[PDB]
Write an enzyme that holds these catalytic residues in place. Structure first.
Site, short mmCIF file in Angstrom:
data_model
loop_
_atom_site.label_atom_id
_atom_site.label_comp_id
_atom_site.label_asym_id
_atom_site.label_seq_id
_atom_site.Cartn_x
_atom_site.Cartn_y
_atom_site.Cartn_z
N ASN A 8 -0.12 8.71 1.07
CA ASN A 8 -0.65 8.82 -0.29
C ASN A 8 -0.96 7.43 -0.82
O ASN A 8 -0.07 6.73 -1.31
CB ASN A 8 0.33 9.57 -1.20
CG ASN A 8 -0.23 9.84 -2.60
OD1 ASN A 8 -1.38 9.51 -2.91
ND2 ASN A 8 0.59 10.45 -3.45
N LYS A 10 -2.57 6.68 -3.40
CA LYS A 10 -2.60 6.73 -4.87
C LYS A 10 -3.86 6.05 -5.42
O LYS A 10 -4.92 6.12 -4.80
CB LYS A 10 -1.30 6.17 -5.47
CG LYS A 10 -0.06 6.90 -4.98
CD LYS A 10 1.21 6.41 -5.63
CE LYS A 10 2.37 7.31 -5.24
NZ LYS A 10 3.62 7.01 -5.98
N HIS A 93 1.94 16.67 -7.65
CA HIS A 93 2.55 15.35 -7.56
C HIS A 93 3.19 14.95 -8.88
O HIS A 93 2.64 15.23 -9.95
CB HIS A 93 1.54 14.30 -7.11
CG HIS A 93 2.17 13.02 -6.66
ND1 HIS A 93 2.56 12.03 -7.54
CD2 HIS A 93 2.51 12.58 -5.43
CE1 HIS A 93 3.10 11.03 -6.86
NE2 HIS A 93 3.08 11.34 -5.58
N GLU A 95 3.45 12.20 -10.59
CA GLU A 95 2.62 11.40 -11.50
C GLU A 95 1.62 12.24 -12.29
O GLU A 95 1.32 11.93 -13.45
CB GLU A 95 1.91 10.28 -10.73
CG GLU A 95 2.84 9.11 -10.40
CD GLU A 95 2.59 8.51 -9.02
OE1 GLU A 95 1.48 8.67 -8.47
OE2 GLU A 95 3.53 7.89 -8.48
N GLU A 163 10.15 15.56 -3.51
CA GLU A 163 10.09 14.22 -4.06
C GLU A 163 10.96 14.09 -5.31
O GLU A 163 10.49 14.35 -6.42
CB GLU A 163 8.64 13.78 -4.32
CG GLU A 163 7.73 14.86 -4.90
CD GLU A 163 6.51 14.30 -5.61
OE1 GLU A 163 6.18 14.81 -6.69
OE2 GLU A 163 5.88 13.35 -5.09
N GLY A 169 8.87 5.31 -6.05
CA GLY A 169 8.46 3.95 -6.42
C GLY A 169 9.53 3.07 -7.04
O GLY A 169 9.22 2.01 -7.59
N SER A 209 10.32 6.56 -1.78
CA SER A 209 10.72 5.27 -1.20
C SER A 209 11.06 5.36 0.29
O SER A 209 12.14 4.94 0.72
CB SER A 209 11.85 4.62 -2.01
OG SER A 209 11.48 4.46 -3.37
#
Lengths: 246, 246
Positions: A8, A10, A93, A95, A163, A169, A209
């Protein structure tokens, strides 16, 4: 069960940086029949990325519309993606849930659209730090999966991603034990809603991560079938993360 | 003032249909120094569309991110658009306000990101039926324009679009006189906030079911400088809409 390593990218990249990264990716010798390796560039980078990547690498887009074709400015429908032979989509996702009001209902409508247009879906979910500390992880995970799980007809075509929101992150990776425990529970939810055969073939990946040092111990777990890699997939050493699944 | 005719394909098109549509568009001879003709395909169609269309046609994307580069899955940043040499962007389109939670703040931050990255912005706004029936048109228009208008540093590079919401995809074209009165007020809002010379320089377009029949009567109004065209721009007859602004 076939392993699945996803990149990904992003909201990152230039035409030149992709040219350079795609070149290092291509140098890695792997069998596409034994291992799925998927790259998810920005929508406008897709053609450039697909041209440069060798056919052993699978490709997809980071989001797909809940609407079909019509008056929806800024949207990429599932039928448009199928016409362009885009194989994979990312749905749900963190985000997009956090910044763009994407709900569990949006997730299922995107999945239903992707499935009826014969696209392969990478469906994301996970609990926050507060929900983790309140011992609500399984309650939250069960709720998030049940939102869409009934739509799955082919269990090779839908790929789940755990996730944990606190791991994305931040550098605070979930221990291979913590990830495995949730992964085992996710597979139990799939078993009890869809069947044991359907649960035994669905890929459940870890996101949050993943790097070159922790990937080996994560992939070794019985219920972890690969990764959705963020920051580390922007790096040339991403080939070593693919190597851990070989 | 240089006229400006924009094709908003929205969430529509296949590779073959774009090939067929661009081929008929290319047949129309026009001077790009006398008239700006911009087409906005789906993000994943951009490369295809840009290659197919002749250099006289300008191109852009239907949405840009408020965020820069980084962990924003599904987003297309203004830096990424700049690197692809994507000239134009649509911001604040009614459909993104309606279905995707886009606010006046998001519009401001998208415009700032676009101008920072030297992109040209087609910025959309407009009142609903309920706001028009409550006689709040001028109040709503003023509030929507004032949300971003002070960011404009170059008045050839930002293009405004009046979208009466009741006119979008409904065939409920606002009468030339009704549109004129709003366009005239928008120009005065730009006058009191940016200056007179800047108000007379900025392009203000009408958006709301423009077709081959009504286009000439709309473009003939003194404060209507072109159109953002939806469904009619998916037709080969879109060339005739361009002809009315020539």
């Amino acid at each position: 069960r076939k392993y699945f390593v996803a990149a990904n990218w992003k909201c990152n990249g230039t035409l030149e940086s992709i040219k350079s990264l795609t070149n290092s990716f291509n140098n890695l010798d792997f069998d596409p029949s034994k291992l799925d390796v998927v790259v998810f560039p920005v929508s406008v980078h897709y053609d450039h990325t697909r041209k440069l990547l060798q056919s052993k690498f699978s490709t997809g887009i980071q989001n797909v519309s809940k609407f079909g074709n019509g008056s929806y400015t800024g949207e990429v429908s599932a039928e448009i993606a199928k016409d362009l032979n885009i194989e994979y989509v990312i749905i749900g996702h963190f985000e997009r849930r956090k910044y763009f009001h994407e709900t569990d209902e949006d997730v299922r409508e995107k999945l239903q659209a992707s499935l009826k247009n014969n696209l392969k879906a990478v469906v994301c979910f996970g609990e926050s730090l507060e929900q983790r500390e309140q011992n609500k992880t399984i309650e939250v995970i069960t709720k998030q999966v049940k939102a869409f799980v009934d739509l799955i007809d082919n269990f090779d075509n839908v790929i789940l991603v755990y996730e944990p929101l606190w791991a994305i992150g931040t550098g605070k990776t979930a221990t291979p034990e913590q990830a495995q425990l949730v992964h085992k529970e996710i597979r139990k939810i799939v078993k009890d809603t869809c069947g044991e055969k359907q649960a035994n073939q669905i890929r459940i990946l870890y996101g949050g991560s993943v790097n070159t040092e922790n990937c080996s111990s994560l992939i070794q777990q019985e219920d972890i079938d690969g990764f959705l890699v963020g920051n580390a997939s922007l790096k040339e050493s991403f080939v070593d993360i693919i190597k851990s699944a070989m």
